[PDB]
Amino acid sequence: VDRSNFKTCDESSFCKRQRSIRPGLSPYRALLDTLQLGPDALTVHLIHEVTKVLLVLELQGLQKNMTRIRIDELEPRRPRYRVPDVLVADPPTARLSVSGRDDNSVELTVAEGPYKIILTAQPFRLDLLEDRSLLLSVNARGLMAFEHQRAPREPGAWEETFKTHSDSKPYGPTSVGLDFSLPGMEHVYGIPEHADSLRLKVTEGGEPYRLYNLDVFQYELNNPMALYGSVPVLLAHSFHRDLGIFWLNAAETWVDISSNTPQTDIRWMSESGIIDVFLMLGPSVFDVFRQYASLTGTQALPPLFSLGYHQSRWNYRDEADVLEVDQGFDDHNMPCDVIWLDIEHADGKRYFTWDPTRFPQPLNMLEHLASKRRKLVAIVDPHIKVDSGYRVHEELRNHGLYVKTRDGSDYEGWCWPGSASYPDFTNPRMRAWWSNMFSFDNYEGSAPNLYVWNDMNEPSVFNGPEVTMLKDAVHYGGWEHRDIHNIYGLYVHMATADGLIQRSGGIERPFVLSRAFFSGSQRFGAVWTGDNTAEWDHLKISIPMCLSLALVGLSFCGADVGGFFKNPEPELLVRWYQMGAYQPFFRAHAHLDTGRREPWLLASQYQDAIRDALFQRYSLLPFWYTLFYQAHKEGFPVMRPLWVQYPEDMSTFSIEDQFMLGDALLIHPVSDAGAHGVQVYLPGQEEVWYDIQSYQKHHGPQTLYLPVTLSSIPVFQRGGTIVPRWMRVRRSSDCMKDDPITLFVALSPQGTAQGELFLDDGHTFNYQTRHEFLLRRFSFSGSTLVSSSADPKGHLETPIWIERVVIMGAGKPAAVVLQTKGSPESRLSFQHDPETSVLILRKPGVSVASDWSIHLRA
Amino acid sequence: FYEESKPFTCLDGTATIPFDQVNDDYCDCKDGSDEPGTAACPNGSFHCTNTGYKPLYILSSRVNDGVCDCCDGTDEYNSGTVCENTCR
Ligand SMILES: *[C@@H]1O[C@H](CO)[C@@H](O[C@@H]2O[C@H](CO)[C@@H](O)[C@H](O)[C@H]2NC(C)=O)[C@H](O)[C@H]1NC(C)=O
Ligand SMILES: CCCCN1C[C@H](O)[C@@H](O)[C@H](O)[C@H]1CO
Ligand SMILES: [Ca+2]
Ligand SMILES: [Ca+2]
Incomplete structure (x- = not known):
């Protein structure tokens, strides 16, 4: 990295202003005479004792143990941004009742308890309790700061420059910030994306964690610099409880973490918008996951193929290269579901086109891959070459759908195709236009087995400040870029996913990989950790980065296998395939200047280890698929x-x-x-x-x-678990998706185990629109293994059967009996290893759709 | 009175199984020799007879995988992909 291309807190005038406010007595106080209580909310006016600026606090108790705090100006000069399209529903509320009151304090009970909220008037403070246990305090260090909108037109509070870029900043200082105290909490997590440790570090002696979607070339490790995505969700864990804080703000955000009877304090500082924060009170981490999923939704159920192995690089040269790579997998007995096409596939970085030299017959290439039961992914970025011969540019220019500068003209940056414009994905009509561009009629050369990759959607602007869009660029509704920055990427991802759904008449599930993201991005597909490097420490960091994403709802995470930049040594590449084989999004990818690293180019010992990794992943696809269904259903x-x-x-x-x-x-x-x-x-x-x-x-x-x-x-x-596998490893997941299952039963010390299995057609919404799926429960106890329905609404016509059962921790039986409605009682042959206590039951032969039992007789 | 037929011995001698365990869609031999016609063994092979042309062997994992591996199409007999003879 070149750190000088990216602002430190001191170089971001609003961060410097906010961060200069040190712990003390807050100038804010609530005016209890203005307090109003309704069934859905409590409102009260707050005043800054010095400036006399009036604010309105809207405090709400919510169903599922949550509290919402919103603060806005009482009489604003212009409306403040409130983040749209992230919340899936208007959160169901819970009634606040006054259970205590004096001249300086109001105690509120949430519904019929046990949750309670204490509002202190002077200085303004909120305390959230469960019965007698204090869970969290708000403004305990007096760090609340709400810069009111002054009359339109000190250092850098108005016009501001960074390197050669100027921000005209017409509204001046409008930043908002608030601190939270977490008694008993010493471990905090989340707020991706940073190439840092899973357990977040105290920021006291250095920089706050930054949330501002940015393209950071050659990013480095164990530092708080902002990367490509931003999820403003912090989780706090202790032996006793779990809490979460969800700061719903789309503007540049800095997070300070400090500790001190152990306690962690968190402060959020945002450039614009309102204060809108959700406190998710658990008490378990699973309760917090549910709470957050109730607000922003759940992970979109990936089509099964997207859970297989993806082969990519910048760039496969042409149709011959793609077909040789495809044939290479089959000749070397290595499975692969998808082959990826980076930016060189298009006509000079004009998205939705094909280079006629390299790819003259895209439909024929797609047909060849469909005959191997494989898919392709094509890159489609949100920057459009300014070229009057390019229909996408002409249509967007003509309909005024581009991001604008203040003078009203279309913003032009320097990007992958030179002078480029940026479609305004905040505009619902622009997203509809984009979705419609994915129809097979509009996207010539595309087919049902072509999926999409959204890159550089921060947006990455090569000539821009910090390689992004000017703060004062103008979007839909007249909002500035500064107001919406962190949701730009999400909207690109959303519109692309809707395009893939729509092109199929609403039947096919989408597959979209996105670089940039925000809260709610889980609803649209997969994300990856961007441009990592072919080094051991980047291999290591893939775990904490994807775990930080998982904690905040983004389950479909991965890192480029082998590393993006540089050439990995063979041993590192092997370890990376093994790591990637056990991570949700599994893609090998490499920068333009790297050597070719398709796995069969290596010496045989390395090829063998890689093949082993791939076989392990493919065999576990039923398990992966079930975990993704659980994420989709429960969060x-x-x-x-x-x-x-x-x-x-x-x-x-x-x-x-x-x-x-x-x-x-x-x-x-x-x-x-x-x-x-x-x-x-x-x-x-x-x-x-x-x-x-x-x-x-x-x-x-x-x-x-x-x-x-x-x-x-x-x-x-x-x-105590049962893991389903497809032991017959074939060349792609489509080949395997109707095959028989082997159940791996690992007995607990009590001789029990359980596990689920989700199955459907592998790619459509039929599971939700027609209830065409299976959710099976496998349970073992005493001396019996039972399959029962875990969701009787799901029915599926499938040839899938149980071919084998492997029981770990079992004695040698005398006999094995299978019972199933419609068949006579069956006797199974079996094999037992007395050294390992492993029992293998041969060919149960029963449909996965049927209830059945297997009894082990002594 | 009636003489019984002898069972099947795996080519690697690891076991002996009845003939209803040959091509029964479950792998019983460590060498995969009980399943020459199916996808049940991880190390098995399927013989493309390719009547009139050169015969080929393919991986067992390619039997009924929905992909046409044999020029005669005999590897796809119960998969829903109907393979044409492309041996010429
Ligand atoms: C909402 O909060 C209550 C209280 O914290 C949760 O109920 C407790 O759950 C724990 C297990 O984690 C039990 O040991 C307690 O006895 C329960 N207490 C009460 C008062 O019920 C509840 O599960 C949470 N609900 C949701 C939906 O998150
Ligand atoms: C610098 C030009 C664009 C770079 N892209 C960034 C992205 O993260 C990589 O995965 C891509 O391979 C690359 C080329 O589109
Ligand atoms: Ca057999
Ligand atoms: Ca085949």
Whole structure:
């Protein structure tokens, strides 16, 4: 990185103003005589004692243990921005009742308790309690600052320059900020995107965490610089409780974290808009996940193919290269679902076009890939070449759908295609136009097996301040770029996803990868950690970066396998395939100047280890798919920090060299050159863990030193779980999606286990519009394995059957009996290893759609 | 009275199975020899007879995968992809 291209807090005049306000007695006080209480809200006026500016606090109790605090000017010169389209619904409220009152304080009960809120008039403060336990305080350090709108037209409060760029700043200083105190909390998480540790660091001695969607060339590690995406959600965890703070603001935001009986204080500082904050009171982390999903929605259910392996680079040269890469996978027995087309595929970076030299017959290329049951992804960026011969440009220019400067003309930056304009994705009509451009008639050469990648959607503007859009550019409704910046990317992602849905007549689920994102981006597809580097420490950081995303609802995360920049050594590439094989979005990608790194170009030992990784991923597709269905339905993260499953185990709170997939698999990928072992922490009092390769059983809690080879992927199955797999690995997921299942039952010390399985057609909305899916529950206890429906609304015509059952932690039975309605009782043959206590049941042969039971007789 | 037929022995000698375990869509032999006609074994092979032309062997994982592997199309017999003979 060149840090001088990016503002430090001191270089951002509003951050400097806000951050200069130090802990003290707040000048804000509430005027209790103006207090009004309704069924849905409490309102009261606040005043700054010095300036006499009046503000309105709207305080609401909400269903599902949440509190909403909104602060705006009572008499604004011009309306302040309120973030649209992020919230999925108007949050259902809970009544606040006055249960206590004096001259300086009002105690409010939320519904019939146990939650309570204490409003203190002077100095203004809010305290949120559950019965007698104080959960959180607001403005406890007196850091609330609300810069009112002054008369339109000290250092840098108005016109402001950074390097060679000037911001005319017509409204002057309008920043808003507020602090929160979290007694008993020492560990805080979230606010992606930063190439930093999962457990967030105190900012006291340095820079605050920055949230401003930016394209940071050659980004570096373990620092708070703002990257491509911004999710203003902070989670706080202790042995006793979980809390979350969701700061609904789309403007440039800085977050200060400090500690001090242990307690963490958080301060948010935003350039514009209102103060709109949700306090999500848990008490468990799963309760916080639900609370947040109720506000912003859940992860969109990926089409199954998108959970397979993606092969990319900048750039596959032409149709021959794409077809040789496709054939390369098959000749080397390595599965792959998607081949990606970067910017060189288009006609001179004119999106929605094809270079006629390199790709003269796109439909024929797509047909060839469809015959291999594979897909393609094409890059479509939100910058349009200013060219009168380019129909997209002409239509957007003619309909005035571009982002504008203050003088009313179309903003022009320097970008991938030279002079380029930026469609205003904040405009609902622009998003409809964009969606309509994805019709097969409009996007010539596209087909149902062509999906999309949205890159440079921060927006990345090559000649712009910090490589982005001027703050004073103008958007829909007359809002400035500064007001909306962090949702630009989300809107691109939203419109692209709607385009893929619409082009199919609303039947097909979309697949869109986006670089930039905000709260709510989970609803539109996948995201990745951008332009990483081919180095061991970037391989390591993929875990904390994707975990920070998972915690805030973005379950479909990944990092470029092998690293984007530079050439990875073969050993690093292998370890990266192994890491990526156990992360949600699994794509190998590489910068323009790197050597070719398709996995069969390596020496045979490296190819073999990679093939092994790919087989493991493909076999686990039913498991991945079920975890994504659970995320879509409940809002629970797919990839999890260990502290999510072990909330009382304090030694797990900072772990970032391991993670869990659901509650069933614990992964400790090898992330060092020349490693011959890894220290694996296996938590849980009275928990057992099975090494999935050796079937060796280990009791928790322990730190195990596990030996590793080049092919090793340290993965442990938790006792008490059932993991479904497709053991017949084929060339792509479409090939496998009707195949029989093998159930891997890991017995708890009580001899029990459970797990679910979701199945549908693999790609349409038929699961939701027609209830065409299966949600099975597999449960084991005593000496019986049972399949029952976990959602009787779901019916599915499928040839999928149970071909095998593998039970870890079992004795040798005398007989195995299968019962299922419509069939006579069946006797299964079996194999047992007494050394490992592994029992393999042969060919149950029962439909996955049927209820059944398998009894083990002694 | 009636003499019984002998069971099947895997080519690797690892087991002996009845003939209803040959091409029964479950892998019983470590060498994959009980499933030459199906996709059930991870190390099996399927023989493209390619009547009139050169015969080819393909991976068992390519039997009924919906992709045409054999020029005679015999690998796709119960998948929903109907393969044409492209052996010429
Ligand atoms: C809302 O808050 C209440 C109170 O914190 C939650 O109920 C408690 O849940 C814990 C388990 O985490 C129990 O041990 C307590 O006994 C429960 N207390 C009460 C008063 O019910 C409740 O689960 C939360 N609900 C949601 C939807 O998040
Ligand atoms: C600098 C020109 C655009 C760079 N893109 C950035 C993106 O994150 C990468 O994945 C792409 O490969 C690349 C080319 O479009
Ligand atoms: Ca068999
Ligand atoms: Ca085939």
